[model samples]
Target: QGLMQFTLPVRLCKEIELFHFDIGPFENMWPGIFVYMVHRSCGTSCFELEKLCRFIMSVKKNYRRVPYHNWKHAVTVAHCMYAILQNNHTLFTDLERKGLLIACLCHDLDHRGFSNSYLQKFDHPLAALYSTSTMEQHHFSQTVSILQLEGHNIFSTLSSSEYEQVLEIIRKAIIATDLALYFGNRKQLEEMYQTGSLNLNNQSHRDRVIGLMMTACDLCSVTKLWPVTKLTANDIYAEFWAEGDEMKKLGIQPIPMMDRDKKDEVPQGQLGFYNAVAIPCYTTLTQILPPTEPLLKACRDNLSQWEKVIRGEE
Candidate 1:
């Protein structure tokens, strides 16, 4: 971490006062939109306004300029979370909501366009620092570092106890974004929901729900409009193939999914990903939180479009 740059307070447009994900002032002005999103999710009084904007700037700076896992992905995911929170804002406490919003925004902080396996295999310093969930752990650490900067401590208004608790949430939820963890825990969540054991009033179940919610927001690309979904997939695959190219330069073989040479397989892979991951995850989320039905519906629509692509109907 370097010295904290003094970030000027950003201007907020009135349009974001009632901004919804599907409607309104979409801008390349990330700081303004994100400032409003933080305000929208956590309420105006929860933050020191200027510092909150600085915190956003600082977090944005930490993310590497990768093809996909960059600032835009982080903010888009947070926006998805913002919309979901608006639909079901009554279910969570103030600190919980705030923690989730920030976690989403910072989940991929300092990402270097490499997956965990890539880091581990390459013996990267980050992998050496954390044996497991290397990038996720680093993302949380980067978030905490940002908060410690002068004038960027958005949680200064919170009691000491509240601050620690929210950090715990930020840590756990950020770590949950490793899709390996998602795959391991997805079935457990579905089982709990079906058994009626998933209770929001219970802290464990509540945190678990938050974990899954973060994953939903992270993968909401599949649940977006057709053009957005298609374009986002290429951005994601572009990163994957970039890593594959690096692996090849080192005399290593990348899995077919990542190998740019296998580009023709991407459509087929997308269908499998939808069936095995995105569709099921959203389906379970909609069952647990019906307000999230839109996510499941959109993913299914994208799924059919992917099928159409495979069937030579594109």
Candidate 2:
């Protein structure tokens, strides 16, 4: 492809909107998506946008061929983050907003279709690299690795200070995708929401909100339309089953959702995940960012579908 023009077709815009800002189905058109978003959000020169496309293409290629957490997953997360930023760009500093988008784009750079706990249990080398947040640490390190690649430094346009600031935020934003961290932060976010005490002007408060926002974006698969949402669940479970099969071959029991033999349990397991994690997280987030309330509703719709699944209705 030649240098990408900033102009996005009307059909792309409509499809983006129709999918509620999720362009997962457009994975093959990632170049257009990256160019349009970079032009709109960063408003840089066409040369820089072309460089960014090279970076995105390289990033997409870098993602491992996993059942989930692949290039398409990263792009979907970025698209959700972009939609959120479009909804309330004023709420975040420019660096925070930019870092959040970049973080989403690289949040799962080379996942191996295994959970962090699986890494620890299997004694994967990545678990030894850092004591905690193993996968997250690897993800961020991969983000930095890709950025350091020749001709792939899309942030080369940034001043040195801006570059450092973006990297720092990227570290925080990417690591925040660990659902473990989200559970730890959820109570504070709920407190802030209940008291209406979130002060975006306060750096600490802003950091917390950005962290939570990343979590929302990372898990926003649950917030998509039913077909999209179901497809996502299928892909994830496929990955889980593959991992579980490995464990089973070793004579170890797989976790409930991961056990292909327990596929019947998915509706109940997913229902628990939504009620326990997805709904509360999005509910708290939308309280701070009302434009995101649609996410909460979409999640609830998925929950309803899961309920039907459990009830043998669908």
lDDT of each: 0.83, 0.82
Best by lDDT: 1
Q: Residue-wise lDDT of candidate 1 within 24-89, one digit each (tens)?
A: 235356766666676667766677777887898888889887888988888888888887787787
Where model 1 places Cα greater than 4 Å from the true spot, the runs are 1-28
The regions of model 2 sitting more than 4 angstroms off are 1-5, 22-26, 45-47
lDDT of 1 at 112: 93
